[PDB]
Design a protein around this ligand. Structure first.
Ligand SMILES: [Ca+2]
Length: 123
């Protein structure tokens, strides 16, 4: 869910306030996402959006009537390193991986301020 994701981002980027920093960035970071990603950080978000769509097609998630946005998986942050819990079931594990991959991605690409709060006409 959002609480875990926010925590994962802070794990990899300790200087960030993810809800302030990564929400509403480019064409994909935030609600929705369409068009061509504006930069590499936007591409991280596009991949994450796609990862959530995929999660909805997994049989384990479907039988559980799961929602990636509210999924209650467990993870731990140790020395800026994220670990998805082994106790997570197949569906929770997949979603945890989507979140971990995105958090790592965010930490490896440049942040371009001019792409914050992009008017979607550009998407
Ligand atoms: Ca999005």
């Amino acid at each position: 869910a959002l609480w875990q994701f926010n925590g994962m981002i802070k794990c990899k980027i300790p200087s960030s306030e993810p809800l302030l920093d990564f929400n509403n960035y480019g064409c994909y970071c935030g609600l929705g996402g369409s068009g061509t990603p504006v930069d590499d950080l936007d591409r991280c978000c596009q991949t994450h959006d796609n990862c959530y769509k995929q999660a909805k097609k997994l049989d384990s998630c479907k039988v559980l009537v799961d929602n990636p946005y509210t999924n209650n998986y467990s993870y731990s942050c140790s020395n800026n390193e994220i670990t998805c819990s082994s106790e997570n079931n197949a569906c929770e594990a997949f979603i945890c991986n989507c979140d971990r991959n995105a958090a790592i991605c965010f930490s490896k690409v440049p942040y371009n301020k001019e792409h914050k709060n992009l008017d979607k006409k550009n998407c």
